[PDB]
Amino acid sequence: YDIQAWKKQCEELLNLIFQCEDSEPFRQPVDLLEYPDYRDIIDTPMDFATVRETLEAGNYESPMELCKDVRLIFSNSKAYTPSKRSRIYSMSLRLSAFFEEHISSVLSDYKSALRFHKR
Ligand SMILES: Cn1nnc2c1C[C@@H](C(=O)O)CC2
Structure with missing residues (x-):
């Protein structure tokens, strides 16, 4: 609950x-x-x-x-890409999946810590 x-x-x-x-x-x-x-x-x-x-x-x-803000890096790449198969856009998709898989527990732990504090 940190x-x-x-x-x-x-x-x-x-x-x-x-x-x-x-x-x-x-x-x-x-x-x-x-x-x-x-x-x-x-x-x-x-x-x-x-x-x-x-x-x-x-x-x-x-x-x-x-x-x-990290999600904005990815939405900017998607808005700027001339093709959904571009090299830089394809890198953004892989990086977004990696970020989302790792940030999930950070968000869950933070929210759990706030709930415990509120009690
Ligand atoms: C600078 N940048 N950020 N995202 C992207 C790009 C280049 C864009 C293009 O290749 O014209 C594809 C997606």
Whole structure:
């Protein structure tokens, strides 16, 4: 019932994501010189270094807020892809399945900890 445990769990999951070859297109903001029309389609850019920095600055209040920003990395890739069979989009799908499989217990444990505290 540790209410704060999600933070280190999320740091460790981000470490696994940064080791994954599938995360390379998403580690830093999308290069606007390489994709000149990117901001014509994407309203809110997001990347894993921004998620890690926000976590490390103490600017997430819960793992749900972190999960919303990671999900935005994946929804931006899906909105920007010219094809659902593109290389970078295909990497985003695999990485999203890996993230979702690992974040489930972090969210469950955090919510259980809040419920125990409320009692
Ligand atoms: C920068 N980026 N993020 N997601 C994607 C891309 C490139 C896009 C394309 O290949 O034109 C496919 C999906």
